Subunit: 509 residues, 4 copies
């Protein structure tokens, strides 16, 4: 009954996958923990199985990774970049089958599965350039005969815990940057995307092996809360990068702080689009639709709140309704499909509960709101009007395609309503007004980590630092100087002179 044993899924074996897969890699493959089966969310059929990490596997792997670091940190950063360049090429060679696996096991449409691998590929090439650039300034000392230099050095072992919904690119953004910065990595992906984690690790492991480097430089320990909690408490994990829910990330952040470790937290979002009276509606309507229903509403950057100026609210809602009806639903890997399943049946339950709560709280479902009657975890993309902007359910991140629509009149109030929630990931205004745009970008504007104009809430690219504020946790990935989170700064004074310190009346020899 496993999909991997059916001839039409034989392409899975191009990624090195089998009926039962080892979920631990440290140079050798293994796994003594519980065996997990992952399921295709489009049809609820089992794909294949992964043997997860026991405690003993975790111990063995952390030790091997930290021994590997002694070799890896001695490799000049540009030569570490060459390894990352080869990882990029190795991903390129498997981009179609890896993207297909992302679609099969996670459930996003094929163009987004492929696009996720391409993002990892492109971050590799960015990191190759960074590998010749990272460092700090040489500064003019106030002391004669002294140099003053800012050095940056790897922190050591970077633990990377990732979420189900970007099962390739979040790891990749952390991996590429941590690697060129001289760190070794230990990955614990989401249990429901274990095959993706194994497949990516097979690709990287071959590059490391072909370059005669210890594979534990990019270690893997598949598991769930058990392994993740161990990483959060483990003093040997010098930096823990955690992408996931605010609820879990809060506890991870506390555990890392308890041991004076470093954490990089990429947590929940509740992202608003604001359409002012002067907005180009032919831009607003498709922008809101694709940002709200993309990935079936399961992006951290998904648009979940849409504020529309009262003068245009009804027209925008009507136009969105007509466009929602045209969304093409199907298997996520099938041609021209725009909309696939939610990742789990529990996500369907949370969807239904939020729709019910919105209705009981005075909202009107103007489109969608129901489960779809087909195999897998499909729900209708949903638009809710009439709720108060401070309704409890509107302030909650429900990881599903529910778009709460609100009216506003004035700029100051709607900026405050963007900022009033606990999350702080992405935000967008649609307007032509020059002053409003720079106020939005200013100290009295959006409080989010991503602050966009005339592009919706998923508007981000690898050249910038990606992340959020407030309960989104404060970490950054990929661009700008995000690399500094993966290294330790030292401020270094070098006395190269023959000068002696003042004796201060003491008779020294």
């Amino acid at each position: 009954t496993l999909l991997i044993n059916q001839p039409q899924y034989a392409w899975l074996k191009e990624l090195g996958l089998r009926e039962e897969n080892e979920g631990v890699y440290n140079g050798s493959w293994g796994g003594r923990g519980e065996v997990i089966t992952t399921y295709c969310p489009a049809n609820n059929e089992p794909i294949a199985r992964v043997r997860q990490a026991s405690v003993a596997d975790y111990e063995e792997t952390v030790k091997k990774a930290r021994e590997a670091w002694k070799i890896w940190a001695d490799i000049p950063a540009p030569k570490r970049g060459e390894i990352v360049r080869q990882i990029g090429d190795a991903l390129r060679e498997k981009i179609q089958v890896l993207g297909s696996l992302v679609s099969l096991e996670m459930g996003k449409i094929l163009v987004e599965g492929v696009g996720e691998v391409q993002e990892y590929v492109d971050i590799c090439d960015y990191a190759v350039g960074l590998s010749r650039m990272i460092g700090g300034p040489i500064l003019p000392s106030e002391r004669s005969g002294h140099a003053l230099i800012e050095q940056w050095n790897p922190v050591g072992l970077v633990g990377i815990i990732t979420a189900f919904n970007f099962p390739v690119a979040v790891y990749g953004a952390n991996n590429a940057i941590a690697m060129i910065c001289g760190n070794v990595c230990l990955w614990k992906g989401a249990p429901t995307t274990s095959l993706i984690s194994v497949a990516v690790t097979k690709i990287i492991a071959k590059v490391l092996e072909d370059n005669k480097l210890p594979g534990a430089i990019c270690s893997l320990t598949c598991g769930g809360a058990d392994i993740g909690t161990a990483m959060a408490k483990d003093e040997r994990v010098n930096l823990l990068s955690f992408t996931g829910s605010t609820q879990v990330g809060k506890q991870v952040g506390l555990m890392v702080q308890e041991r004076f470790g470093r954490s990089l937290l990429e947590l929940g979002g509740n992202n608003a689009i604001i359409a002012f009276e002067d907005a180009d509606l032919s831009l607003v309507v498709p922008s809101a639709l694709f940002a709200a229903v993309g990935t079936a509403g399961q992006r951290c950057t998904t648009a979940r709140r849409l504020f529309i100026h009262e003068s245009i609210h009804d027209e925008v809602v009507n136009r969105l309704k007509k466009a929602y009806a045209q969304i093409r639903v199907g298997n996520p890997w099938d041609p021209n499909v725009l909309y696939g399943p939610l990742h789990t049946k529990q996500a369907v339950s949370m969807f239904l509960g939020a729709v019910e709560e919105a209705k009981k709280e005075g909202g009107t479902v103007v489109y969608g709101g129901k489960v779809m009657d087909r195999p897998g975890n499909y729900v209708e993309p949903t638009i809710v009007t009439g709720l108060g902007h401070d309704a409890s359910i509107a302030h909650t991140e429900t990881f599903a395609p529910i778009l709460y629509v609100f009216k506003f009149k004035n700029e100051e109030e709607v900026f405050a309503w963007n900022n009033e929630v606990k999350q702080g990931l992405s935000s967008s205004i649609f307007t032509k007004d020059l002053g409003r745009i720079f106020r939005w970008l200013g100290p009295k504007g959006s409080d989010c980590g991503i602050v966009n104009v005339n592009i919706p809430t998923s508007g981000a690219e690898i050249g910038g630092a990606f992340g959020g504020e407030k309960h989104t946790g404060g970490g950054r990935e990929s661009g700008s100087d995000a690399w500094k989170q993966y290294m330790r700064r030292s401020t270094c004074t070098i006395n190269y002179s023959k000068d002696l310190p003042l004796a201060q009346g003491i008779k020294f020899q």
Copy 2:
């Protein structure tokens, strides 16, 4: 019997101090909490009194500071820099009496009290430059017709909790940078340096008032653990900068993390000097003496571990003992005095406790070890030989002038011994060897935030970022890009084109 009522301390009134002083400033002066008397540690005589903050004082002050922020954040950063320039000049005008007050209330020698004010003065002038420079890059977007900009904006209210031992400069470093970054400040200094906090706040208040700015931009709430804990828990404190012990800072860090605030932690040190066989001993011996006994061993950067190559260990110890015997002890304001008292009577008891534990664990006191028979909190500067490097007492920060001396043979082991403690603030090697110097600066070298060569563990200047790693807490102050900790980064994509997104087969209006 208050020193401020005695003729030879009449200079205290030049700072605006009187017998009983208001310890709350938010534009108005007040203080309805407990009245604290601070004492001169050189003679245990009371100086004057300060009315501390009640809960109601704290609440009123936080609200007024956040109201002032609405005004302050709208002032262009270069004009904020002009205010910080005037603060610098106002400190210059009072540098002698303020330095004298540091010597009187805190107990460090006069040149260091004056020197502490000078560092604040110099940070002000550095911040004036920064006020025309802070910001982020404009990046090349991959998207046609889009701009990509990294913006930086103030976090809002920066709470600043400071230690007794640098009662002017730690606050000043945070104040000057936080101000040009567009933040308002709330200061809670050490209770035993309350008069210093009041005096500094009087200087700043006059500058703000002369510029017709709300005084709550630089608010003061004197108090102890009650006020500091409230700040740690207060969601209105956007960044909490904490300088203090690791024990207290750990709890502050956890409380801030619990509420997804920002913390900047500057915690304990256990700083090593390492002298290799090729070291210039005429440089090593005075360097170690002044870095170990300076400020009576009460700098966070004090040298507390001295590793000496076995070939020169006995010679260096003998030379140190002969030099320690020449240290000039007396009132810290008297001319040519090098060595004053410890800050508190509790510090004297902690000193004696550590000396006893050192003896139990196998160490030998070769110089000092006892309380001096004189008024005030004077203890002998102390040298202990023969302890194992991993002795529990050697791994502890005892904030007293106790220098633990160790032998070593090879570079790899002694670098490891530098790194093996939980603290990670400052570190120094003395050597002539070019390769050893660059290895010390590299990934297998010192793990501290300050990594020095042929200058001891207090070698730092305002152009660099100041702080440590590990249990020193990770925060940075003053130079390089430390300013970014006082601001929030946004990555901003601006679509300025008339281009519409691809319709993806949906028919839009």
Copy 3:
């Protein structure tokens, strides 16, 4: 008959000026060249005399400056910054009388004379911050056991030749930055602002002398084309910063290039304001008036071309005409005056010549065009319509308040018309259109060094790099990384390892 001998102008002595002044400073004051008398352009009366540099003076001064450099370059940059900080304070103390001298000898209104000194003061404070920041990155070498560092070091002697119209601030921007970068300076100002040059040099000389530094660090050799040509040809002048006409600057550039020196060229402008149909006309009209008539049209950044969309052309011209009639003319040191005299009688004659040329080429004088009926070099601020945008006189920089007005219809054509002249200093558009703004800032937009939006052509501040492209010469002053022009870059590889190169089959010992 000298103004300095009349009681009405006795304040001139507060600047150390006498009836006859030494125009050479190299630590000693002297001048064996021709004695020049400078005149007040508001009343054509002689002010006082300056003894200019002979060739022997020039030779002696260059030698003393280069000897002084040996001392100055050994002073740590932050301590050089402290000298520059004190220069800023000394300027502050004389700001009113020095600004008054700028008004008296050069002729601009008092607020602009004072404002020029204030700009120098604020550049000093900027440079104080830079003095702790200048330097380059430490980069990750591809070679094991090697460091790679980018160093910056002073070029040596920076010659500074300046124009009459900013007789304080151009020198100051070069002086403050060159000084913190470790260079010594040699100033040759405009002959007609010799008293200003002497007065500034007296202020700086006292600071240097008070700090026990050789005065030749900021040397002065007053003179005309002969001294300027000598500097252009002198291999001992490592960097020649030249501010002045394109005609003279072209020759200075060729002379410096012939000897493989460095030049920093700040040459002529022909700056355009473009008002689009959507512009705020209540912003456009005052912006254009003040940018066109400010300093009697004698700024390098003066607006000389005004392109107005055809739909609003007639209205904007009518509003400009009504406002020009209200310009208040008089002695530039009187506070109601917006508008002072031109700098020379020749300038008045050239104004008249340009007006006649504009009429010959088909232009209509709609306001002004004539000399004013009063003593001093006063001309009417002048507006000319009906010329072709490619009229010869419109493409010429005439240093007089003549504003040439043109119609346009389309964005691409008017951007091209902005760009079609040989000058490339400043440019401004007035518009509300977001896309037009970013196209103006982009690769098909303005070709100038200053590219402004809704602020006119004088919109610049010290935090940015100031300068132009094309025949404006390409140099930059003040902000961003302009400091790099005053230093030499080295890319430094340091092998700190014991590794030997591969023998490649050769037998070495």
Copy 4:
């Protein structure tokens, strides 16, 4: 008799070369100028022919390149980076045959021909990273309601004139950087490496055409001084990057300055190695040998002056002589060969002239000094002792393997002797002394653009800016912020507020 018509050289056809090759590419291939034949310097046999550019070819190519720029500058920099990435891959695929062509037509050994292609490959990958990074800062304006941004835009057409001795990598460093900065390029290579220029252009043209981009983005006009002089005088060539002799580059620099263009000059070297008394002689002797004789002394970074402390001078010379005798001479494609021919017979004549001049100026040839009796342009690598450090011939760059050896005693004199020549490219000291190393790197140290320690004068890598000072011309290539030379800076103030300027007593409408 053409090598390309012989079966042993059929591999040349892998580069698309034939008996007679078009030497003009602008999207179409042509060439109506003179047909040049290039010869193998190892045996003086003709290889193949190239049809060079006539004036009409040049004029059409410049126009086509500037038309192509309209498309290219509108492509986002990251997407321009993607093109450069594919150029790197296309070079990778041809690296062996292209390296072999460099050895055949230029004459350097095969590992260096391949290594030159590899440097271009790695610059492409570095540029891919930079394509997401280039830009300037957003700065904090002193003006309320204004933004201040530093923009960078392409200059347009970058003409690239290259020397014979790095016929791939110099072009590639300029091409990759100019391309990601949004410029189109026009290449005129050395006439004696025309086949290399054609082969590289064939590789790039295929990438451009495969991407449906106009081929004139990377245009080629093969020719000699006629085309190069036309480029130097052509106002349509916005930046002219020139690599070549100081003698030619001086005139190029003057012609570009005459038209207020931009030049990037990479001119001659006269690079010194200095061996101090404490140097590692097992490091010095091989370092000096390989840096002096590598590429038969035809690197711009070749070591030409060797200063040895008097205490070790005779020993180092004796060891160098014994090592020179082991240099393996032969065909530069033969695997066992270290030393091939000079590039031309004129180079042989210049070598002989310099050897006899050195003897006439008092030098002694202690090794070599003769032409080799064999086919091709072979001369003996040569060592000359006994010249004064200021002998005219030692101050001249003779592009041939002649090493002039000098004694010295003290550091200050030998630093001055490094600096006393007109050239300023590279420089190296060998020493263990920490203070001497930092003095060498400081303001009283080396005046060159490359300043090395314990690595010889060819020690450079792509992460750093490459170039020299003084008569080396000042330009930089490849790393750090060298990219700014290929773009134009604008300083942009944006008033986004509704604020109007102060009326200054004028009543506007």
